[PDB]
Amino acid sequence: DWVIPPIKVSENERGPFPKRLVQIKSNKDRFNKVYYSITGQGADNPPQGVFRIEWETGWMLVTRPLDREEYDKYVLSSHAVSENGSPVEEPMEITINVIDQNDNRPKFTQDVFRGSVREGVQPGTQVMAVSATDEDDNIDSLNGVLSYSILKQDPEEPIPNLFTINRETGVISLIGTGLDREKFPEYTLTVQATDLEGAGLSVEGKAIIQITDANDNAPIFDPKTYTALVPENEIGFEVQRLSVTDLDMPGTPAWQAVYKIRVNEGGFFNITTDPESNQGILTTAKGLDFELRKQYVLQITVENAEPFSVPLPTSTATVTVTVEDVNEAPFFVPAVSRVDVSEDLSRGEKIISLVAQDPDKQQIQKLSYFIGNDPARWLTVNKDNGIVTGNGNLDRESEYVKNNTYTVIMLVTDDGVSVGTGTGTLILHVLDVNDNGPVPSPRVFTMCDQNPEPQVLTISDADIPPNTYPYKVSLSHGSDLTWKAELDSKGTSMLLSPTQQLKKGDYSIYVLLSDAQNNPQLTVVNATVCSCEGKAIKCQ
């Protein structure tokens, strides 16, 4: 058909109501009276009564103002019946479009936006982002397009133009330079959005930016030069602690100190760090020792764990140390294999005039010499002059003496001012003299009767050679009660044989030898005889 165009109507209209929109006519009215009515939402349906028609003229009206924001369009159905009561025309659809008007102010997405950036970054860096909206049209008008802006950053210091915002997108960026967490950490700037691309109505928001941290700062010592005293030897011990103040953020690696000495003399120092006021705690690496050095001039520089965000001054601490003195024990010089001395020494004679030395050249402390180790008592010391003399009777020949030795240990004490011990061994070579003289091996025989065979006997000397070289056998009172002497060819033994057919048991034979001579006297080597033929038998 020839339909009927949609009807545009403005919003928030205002004048004298009613307002005729249009007029409709059924031509089938030649016959009876026609009754015009109309139906739909806004008609008889909810919102009832916005539009109504004059049953007799065919006029359509808007009865009151409208807000497209509420309902932006309506569709209606129109009718025409006869007085008799019958419909005449197939109904007719009707449309109305509600044209937008700038009745709406915009509104920010949130009531407050927050942001953050680091202090050392470069100009032209994107920080935050902000939103807002207008409910009016924005597809055929500007009643709903906004334009963003900024008008007041607080801390109007260092300067007041650190940022800008993209008018269309509302994004903010760092424009200037001079950000420092250490002086001004959080800005509060006021934003506004406007109707018709900055032309219409405006509103406010608030965005707040916190500033991350940077290693803008270096560490600073609170003393620059310290001093402490120290002892030579127990040690590995705490000398002095140090103080400092970095200014970036505390629990952070831009706040933790790292040290080191420049030069470690004997490399006898270690230094650690501590999460207190991360003071510098210095200590001794390997004890000290001395009388060698009293002075210690060393320097320690301090850094952070992480590198610096800028060239900065490295700052050292210069420190002086002094070693207190402890006084140590003295010592005999050697451990003496000294005196190759003979057995004939006169009880009270100079053996070893000895001396001991003591470390501490503070030496105005003497000591006393004491002896100590010990198989039995011979020797003697002058305690205030360390003089070892030889008292007593010695005898290389016999008991304690093991290999050609006699080892003895002695002491010495550090007095004068405190304490001390000195353990020193002393081996002294004893010597030989020909003391003893020759002696027979077996002392009792068992001779036989009829024809006894030679009674083997031998010789032994306690002395050391030559002193036991060859012999000379001799038979004293009974050199004839019949007894005849004899030597083995290979030196050592002697052959003892009677020369008479003598008696039934129990009787001695006086013996007498010599080796350089010395002559011993020996003696009786008794002789038990019991009935027989010729071989030395078990007796009775």
Ligand X SMILES: *[C@H]1O[C@H](CO)[C@@H](O)[C@H](O)[C@H]1NC(C)=O
> Contacts with ligand X: how many residues (CB under 6 A)?
11
212 binds ligand NAG (CB under 6 A): no
Residue 534: CB partners within 8 Å, gap ≥ 6? 448, 450, 451, 452, 453
Between 193 and 329, whose beta carbon lies closer to ligand NAG? Answer: 329
528 binds ligand NAG (CB under 6 A): no
290 binds Ca ion (CB under 5 A): yes
**Of the listed pieces 45-53, 204-212, 392-400, 487-495, which binds Ca ion according to CB under 5 A?**
392-400
Between 106 and 330, whose beta carbon lies closer to ligand NAG? Answer: 330
Structure tokens at 111: 């009531």
CB of 303 to ligand X, least distance (A): 6
CB of 498 to Ca ion, least distance (A): 29
Could you give the CA distance from residue 191 to residue 128 in angstroms, rounded to a whole number?
12
Could you give the CA distance from residue 271 to residue 242 in angstroms, rounded to a whole number?
10
Interface of this chain with ligand NAG, residues 226 to 255, rule: CB under 6 A = 226-228, 245, 247
Could you give the CA distance from residue 517 to residue 514 in angstroms, rounded to a whole number?
4
Residue 40: CB partners within 8 Å, gap ≥ 6? 74, 75, 76, 77, 94
CB of 463 to Ca ion, least distance (A): 4
Could you give the CA distance from residue 492 to residue 489 in angstroms, rounded to a whole number?
8
State the DSSP H helix or E strand holding residue 337, giving kind and residue range, or none if neither: strand 336-337
Interface of this chain with Ca ion, residues 56 to 85, rule: CB under 5 A = 67, 69
Structure tokens at 432: 């030989």
State the DSSP H helix or E strand holding residue 54, giving kind and residue range, or none if neither: none
Query: Contact at 8 Å (CB) between 148 and 130?
Result: yes
The separation between CA 67 and the C-alpha centre of its own chain, rounded to angstroms, equals: 75
Between 311 and 465, whose beta carbon lies closer to ligand X? Answer: 311
Interface of this chain with ligand X, residues 307 to 336, rule: CB under 6 A = 311-314, 335
Spatial CA neighbour of 447 closest among 492, 504, 499: 504
CB of 356 to ligand NAG, least distance (A): 12
Residue 272 contact, options its own copies, Ca ion, ligand NAG, none, Cβ 5-8 Å cut-off depending on partner type: ligand NAG
Between 89 and 291, whose beta carbon lies closer to its own copies? Answer: 89
CB of 532 to Ca ion, least distance (A): 37
Residue 488: CB partners within 8 Å, gap ≥ 6? 458, 494, 495
**Of the listed pieces 104-112, 216-224, 337-345, 458-466, which binds ligand NAG according to CB under 6 A?**
216-224
Near ligand NAG by CB under 6 A: residue from 10, 97, 385, 404 = 404
> In this structure, is the dihedral angle defined by the CA atoms of residues 505, 506, 512 and 513, taken in order, positive or negative?
positive
180 binds ligand NAG (CB under 6 A): no
CB of 324 to ligand NAG, least distance (A): 13
Near Ca ion by CB under 5 A: residue from 53, 216, 221, 428 = 216
Structure tokens at 85: 């009561």
Near ligand X by CB under 6 A: residue from 409, 464, 524, 532 = 409
Spatial CA neighbour of 428 closest among 352, 370, 349: 352
CB of 270 to ligand NAG, least distance (A): 3
- Examine residue 253 and say whether the peptide bond preceding it is cis (omega within 30 degrees of 0): no
CB of 210 to its own copies, least distance (A): 58
Q: For residue 531, how many C-alpha atoms fall within 13 Å in the half-sphere facing its CB?
A: 1
What is the CA angle 168-172-173, rounded to 5?
A: 125
Query: Contact at 8 Å (CB) between 7 and 93?
Result: no
CB of 52 to its own copies, least distance (A): 14
User: Which residues in this chain contact Ca ion in the complex, by CB under 5 A?
Assistant: 67, 69, 100-104, 134, 136, 143, 180-182, 195, 213-217, 246, 248, 254, 289-291, 304, 325, 327, 358, 360, 395-397, 414, 432-435, 461, 463, 467, 515
User: Which residues in this chain contact ligand X in the complex, by CB under 6 A?
Assistant: 301, 303, 311-314, 335, 409, 423-425
